[PDB]
Design a protein around this nucleic acid. Structure first.
Ligand code: MG
Ligand code: MG
Ligand code: MG
Ligand code: MG
Ligand code: MG
Ligand code: MG
Ligand code: MG
Ligand code: MG
Ligand code: MG
Ligand code: MG
Ligand code: MG
Ligand code: MG
Ligand code: MG
Ligand code: MG
Ligand code: MG
Ligand code: ZN
Lengths: 50, 122, 105, 119, 203, 86
RNA sequence: CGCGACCUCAGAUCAGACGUGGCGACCCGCUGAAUUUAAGCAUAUUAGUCAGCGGAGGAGAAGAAACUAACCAGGAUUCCCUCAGUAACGGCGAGUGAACAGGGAAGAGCCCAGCGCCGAAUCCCCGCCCCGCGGCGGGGCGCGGGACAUGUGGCGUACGGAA
């Protein structure tokens, strides 16, 4: 909204850093059962009703 | 190459600060090498430098808190960091003497009429 | 709807009794715990009798029973005075003392 | 020989003492966990940041978010012994602070970038 | 001693001297706040019989509680349901006003511990009680073996759990053929033993 | 016009992120939470929502003090002792 | 035209301490309905129940008779069985509903005020010496302070007590 506060901008920065795919070196682990992220958030589907 | 703890137990405080400052310089140089890429031989030493900083600060904190409790050991009012912290009610218990304080009447009862040792059927 | 010659029953199951069912699966373990506490008490008082102090001769009230002889709460103070034992010495010896009991006989 | 001048009765200014404590509440003062090394994390090797350094006599640094412009100025002056014209800060949408440290024109920016390692 | 003379002097409340004293003290206590610390007991014989020992650490408060029953906290009329409960005016709060005074004193000072309380006066609109309060942490109580049961954490908020003499009378507990509730721990425990079904293993 | 044209003019917010429970419940007009009751000194909980209780009981978060309380209990609450060095 | 004592009430970032809140399965003090049943329903019932509020503990509460009984009398409290679905309550309708005694588990007794006798003989804090000082304790040295006669401590509490 270009008039953010520090708490809202810090929350959105953590959401940006969470919206990040799984690196390829995860899948070569031994006890891995994780295929994809299943939390890939898009800016149209989940709209963060803060 | 290793910065252990036994060799840091007996050092002077200003030399510990100088070694800490040298480790901070090396930590900043390894961060610059991480951003500029460098090599994996420089990427792997940042953990060793961070744990060495942790060991130096740990030994400094050990020595200063044992010096402070040696200073306040003997006084009646010691600081709250030096006071023992078990739990809330266990700090709010008695004095280990107040639990053993008996009245004069109860001491007279326990003195004049003690619990006797006995057996039957003989 | 009662039908064809039964008892005119009154079951007391109209409250929320299933929340307050007291199941008794604890009780053999409770017998084990009482046995262990009794053996620990008997090992604690090592020359003393394991049951406890001496209980007096006591006859039942309420003319239904009227002939049975029980164990009492304690020996009375007139009994201790005739027997010659002080009431604060009898408790140390192992004699049950209660100050409430009368002695009309 | 004393009369109430004003009809109101205000509470009289009584003497009150100061904190002269018998024991300190904490044994040691808290150490500075905002040191000059810990306040400056790393510089940027962005081509835009290097164009900024080569053109506008600045240095780009990534700083902890709890820092002042005076803290970044004295931090750069303490670490690399270089004087600072000004410190110009923003906060990225990643949580970190970005500091454009405009240097004094008597010292070069490309030379001190070669000293700190970036090129 | 003088305490028996003071005892029957506080008994003879209907005489002119004690009516004058109750009038003056009732005025003086009504013209103060709702809860205030008294520095010395107005009624020392009753304070001593309830447990006030004039030493360091035993504190007393004086407290005003409004007089009358309890009106049901509902809207205008509006007790929805069967006509048993629609009356809101003439219903009585089951716990005593002296225990309400102890309750408010302990609520204002949860750090102190309520011992007991007594009566110092009444108006048409207020009652006046004096509540004995004890320090858990003062050394004169803490080192005294007679009164160091108070310092134990079992006796926290007797004014709330109904363990004092004013709240104990409202519980309906006692020995004999006239109570028959609280014949276990309390009314709750009696109700629980009388309405739990004992389904055994072998039945 | 009570449907889509009424959803269209929804601009300003009523609840924001609280600062004791961190959920979007802090009402901007009443200055209260309604999930924990922030201007009240006590935590809002009720016994008609056992599910909302077990959303945040004590076994939910980090327990960063209570787990070392449990460990110091099973160790014996000893203080200032050191094991025998080599 | 004030000073010095007492009493009531203030101000302190005064020296030293306590409480706030959480969990809440068990416990205590309150408050407290309506579904349902009565083949309707209104007392009753659900029900001192759900919901609501406060309070702790490892258990809580109760507890050593202003008791039960009417007998050749028993003797704190708590819990199990039985009394007993009984006495009793109830549009005596639906339904509700104990207790004594008895058999067990456990068993533990006591302290105050008052009445009085002892020169306040009592208690709290600060300075110094000795002990370990990581649930700040013991002895002594202080016309060092304070609380306290508007009553602290010892004897002593209904089983009697004191000289
Ligand atoms: Mg959209
Ligand atoms: Mg037995
Ligand atoms: Mg009805
Ligand atoms: Mg009790
Ligand atoms: Mg009454
Ligand atoms: Mg609480
Ligand atoms: Mg019906
Ligand atoms: Mg029907
Ligand atoms: Mg409830
Ligand atoms: Mg208890
Ligand atoms: Mg009694
Ligand atoms: Mg009985
Ligand atoms: Mg009933
Ligand atoms: Mg006396
Ligand atoms: Mg005495
Ligand atoms: Zn909240």
């Amino acid at each position: 909204s270009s008039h953010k506060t520090f708490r809202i901008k810090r929350f959105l920065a953590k959401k940006q850093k969470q919206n990040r795919p799984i690196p390829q070196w995860i899948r070569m682990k031994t006890g891995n059962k994780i295929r994809y992220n299943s939390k890939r958030r898009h800016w149209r589907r989940t709209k963060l009703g803060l | 190459a290793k910065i252990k703890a036994r060799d840091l137990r007996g050092k002077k405080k200003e030399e510990l600060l100088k070694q800490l400052d040298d480790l901070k310089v090396e930590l900043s140089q390894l961060r610059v090498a991480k951003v500029t890429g460098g090599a994996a031989s420089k990427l792997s030493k940042i953990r060793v430098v961070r744990k060495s900083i942790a060991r130096v600060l740990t030994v400094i904190n050990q020595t200063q808190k044992e010096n402070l409790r040696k200073f306040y050991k003997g006084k009646k009012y010691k600081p709250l960091d030096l006071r023992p912290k078990k739990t809330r009610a266990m700090r709010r218990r008695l004095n280990k003497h107040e639990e053993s304080l008996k009245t004069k009447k109860q001491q007279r009862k326990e003195r004049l009429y003690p619990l006797r040792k006995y057996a039957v059927k003989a | 709807a009662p039908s064809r010659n039964g008892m005119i029953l009154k079951p007391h199951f109209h409250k929320d009794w299933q929340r307050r069912v007291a199941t008794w699966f604890n009780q053999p373990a409770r017998k084990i715990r009482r046995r262990k506490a009794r053996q620990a008490r008997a090992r604690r008082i090592a020359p003393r009798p394991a049951s406890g102090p001496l209980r007096p001769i006591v006859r039942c009230p309420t003319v239904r029973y009227h002939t049975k002889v029980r164990a009492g709460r304690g020996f009375s103070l007139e009994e201790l005075r005739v027997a010659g034992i002080h009431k604060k010495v009898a408790r140390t010896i192992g004699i049950s003392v209660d100050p409430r009991r009368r002695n009309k006989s | 020989k004393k009369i109430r001048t004003s009809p109101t009765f205000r509470r009289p200014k009584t003497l009150r003492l100061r904190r002269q404590p018998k024991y300190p509440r904490k044994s040691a003062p808290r150490r500075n966990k905002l040191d000059h090394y810990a306040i400056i994390k790393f510089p940027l090797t962005t081509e835009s940041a290097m164009k900024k350094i080569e053109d506008n006599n600045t240095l780009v640094f990534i700083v902890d978010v709890k820092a002042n412009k005076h803290q970044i100025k004295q931090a750069v002056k303490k670490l690399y012994d270089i004087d600072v014209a000004k410190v110009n800060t923003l906060i990225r949408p990643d949580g970190e602070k970005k500091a454009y440290v405009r240097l004094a024109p008597d010292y070069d920016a490309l030379d001190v970038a070669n000293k700190i390692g970036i090129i | 001693g003088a305490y028996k003379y003071i005892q029957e002097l506080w008994r003879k409340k209907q005489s002119d001297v004690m009516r004058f004293l109750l009038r003056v003290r009732c005025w003086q206590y009504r013209q103060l706040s709702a809860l205030h610390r008294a520095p010395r007991p107005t009624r020392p014989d009753k304070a001593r019989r309830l447990g006030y020992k004039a030493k360091q650490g035993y504190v007393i408060y004086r407290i005003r509680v409004r007089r009358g029953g309890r009106k049901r906290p509902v809207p205008k009329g509006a007790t929805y349901g069967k006509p048993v409960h629609h009356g809101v005016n003439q219903l009585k709060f089951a716990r005593s006003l002296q225990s309400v005074a102890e309750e408010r004193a302990g609520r204002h000072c949860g750090a102190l511990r309520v011992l007991n309380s007594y009566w110092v006066g009444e108006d048409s609109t207020y009652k006046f009680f004096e509540v004995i309060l004890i320090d858990p942490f003062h050394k004169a109580i803490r080192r005294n073996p007679d009164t160091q049961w108070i310092t134990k954490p079992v006796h926290k908020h007797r004014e709330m759990r109904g363990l004092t003499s004013a709240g104990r009378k409202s519980r309906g507990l006692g020995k004999g053929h006239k109570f028959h509730h609280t014949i276990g721990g309390s009314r709750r425990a009696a109700w629980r033993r009388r309405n739990t079904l004992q389904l055994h293993r072998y039945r | 016009t009570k449907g889509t044209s009424s959803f269209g003019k929804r601009r300003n917010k009523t609840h924001t992120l609280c600062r004791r429970c961190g959920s979007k419940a802090y009402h901007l007009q009443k200055s209260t939470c309604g999930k924990c009751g922030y201007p009240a000194k006590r935590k809002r909980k009720y016994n008609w929502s056992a599910k909302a209780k077990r959303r945040n009981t004590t076994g939910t978060g980090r327990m960063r003090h209570l787990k070392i309380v449990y460990r110091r209990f099973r160790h014996g609450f000893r203080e200032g002792t050191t094991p025998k060095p080599k």
